């Protein structure tokens, strides 16, 4: 039906400032209030604040909290809706998600996907996808900073028997995961298996054959 | 602010059963609250809105109940499409605030443990590193321990859990367990294998391997 995804930088120094961007794609702020949403690791979602359609003129009204350093604003020739923080620390840390506010069904009707901001004086990390041969599959993406990185086999087709894991973060000070997929015991001739580890905060692309 | 509270917080009721969740509200609310489910790992998603509205596409086996301050959320009977962690909020005033938060883990009967030990990848073995998982693969409860064993011995701190969410299909959790013993030991050894008892399977089990190679 409609579409929003949200997009900006994974990894931001403290100091720096925070900038996201939810696309949309399926209606308008001209009959919408656009707020976000964020939660930190494993917690709950908390308000930051929304922005009114073109009658009330598009007015914002920031969560107390945040109120003084967030400044959400959109462009309608462009359809988006982008969120700047300034002085993100490692509190405002959490997946920040870009919510619109309907009609009745009113708040929160249609959210984006997710977009993990991790605050870190550190920095960047291609990850390292390696082969695991076997009946089940499965791929090693080793090594990389910041999160997350997401997998997926065959860039569609497999799906019902995959298990994709969480994430550690290695003394190396590193995330390493492991997707694996369980598959039919004869069904594995010379036949394909792309590995599909897909990663945005490096800007890195790897599509390891297992 | 007007603080909001959900009851209970992680729970597990079963198959069939009533899962039933309460929050509370610090003031007052009205028709104003509506509720989330949160699937493993995605973004909320509207199950209820003010107080006794069904949404467009979520069952029927789902229901709000009155308005006030006492709130109260009821599934008619819970599947196990259901582990998620469902959240309440209110609208009336701002900032909107939601719930603590509820999780719903489901539960099954023992689905005793898979193992598939997978030997390490030739190249990664390029590194100076090499790092040899083990996998189980659906099993409940999430009760299991791996014991890994070098040749027929060990030297631990290198074992490490991930397990992943309960499925939704099965409910049975799964998890890896990479032994990563790095490089250049790979080798001065032959056997690493990888046992694991469970609540569910009696007496132990194991896939290993003396290696194969070089």
């Known amino acids: 039906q409609v579409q929003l995804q949200e997009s900006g930088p994974g990894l931001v120094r403290p100091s720096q400032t925070l900038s996201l961007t939810c696309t949309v794609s399926g209606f308008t702020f001209t009959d919408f209030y656009m707020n976000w949403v964020r939660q930190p690791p494993g917690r709950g979602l908390e308000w930051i604040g929304f922005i009114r359609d073109k009658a009330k003129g598009y007015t914002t009204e920031y969560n107390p909290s945040v109120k003084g350093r967030v400044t959400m604003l959109v462009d309608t020739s462009k359809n988006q809706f982008s969120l700047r923080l300034s002085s993100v620390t490692a509190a405002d840390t959490a997946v920040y998600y870009c919510?619109?506010?309907?009609?009745?069904?009113?708040?929160?009707?249609?959210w984006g996907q997710g977009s993990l901001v991790t605050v870190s004086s550190a920095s960047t990390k291609g990850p390292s996808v390696f082969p695991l041969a076997p009946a089940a599959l499965g791929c090693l993406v080793k090594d990389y900073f910041p999160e997350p990185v997401t997998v997926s086999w065959n860039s569609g087709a497999l799906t019902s028997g995959v298990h994709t894991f969480p994430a550690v973060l290695q003394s190396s000070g590193l995330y390493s995961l492991s997707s694996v997929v369980t598959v039919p015991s004869s069904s594995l001739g010379t036949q394909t298996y792309i590995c599909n580890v897909n990663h945005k905060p490096s800007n890195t692309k790897v599509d390891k054959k297992v | 602010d007007i603080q909001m509270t959900q009851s209970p917080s992680s729970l597990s009721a079963s198959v069939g059963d009533r899962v039933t969740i309460t929050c509370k509200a610090s003031?007052?609310?009205?028709?104003?609250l509506n509720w989330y489910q949160q699937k493993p790992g995605k973004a909320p998603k509207l199950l209820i809105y003010?107080?006794?509205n069904l949404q467009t596409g979520v069952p029927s086996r789902f229901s709000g109940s009155g308005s006030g301050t006492d709130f109260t959320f009821t599934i008619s009977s819970l599947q196990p499409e259901d582990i998620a962690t469902y959240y309440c909020?209110?609208?009336?005033?701002?900032?909107?605030?939601f719930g603590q938060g509820t999780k719903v883990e489901i539960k099954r009967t023992v689905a005793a443990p898979s193992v598939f030990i997978f030997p390490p990848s030739d190249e990664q073995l390029k590194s100076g590193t090499a790092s040899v998982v083990c996998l189980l693969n659906n099993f409940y409860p999430r009760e299991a321990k791996v014991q890994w064993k070098v040749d027929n011995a060990l030297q631990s701190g290198n074992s490490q859990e991930s397990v992943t969410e309960q499925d939704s299909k099965d409910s049975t959790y799964s998890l890896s367990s990479t032994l990563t013993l790095s490089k250049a030991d790979y080798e001065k050894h032959k056997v690493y294998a990888c046992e694991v008892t469970h609540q569910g399977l009696s007496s132990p089990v194991t896939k290993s391997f003396n290696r194969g190679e070089c």
């Open positions: 003031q007052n609310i009205d028709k104003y």
């Open positions: 003010n107080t006794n």
């Open positions: 909020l209110q609208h009336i005033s701002r900032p909107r605030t």
């Open positions: 919510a619109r506010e309907g009609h009745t069904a009113a708040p929160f009707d249609y």
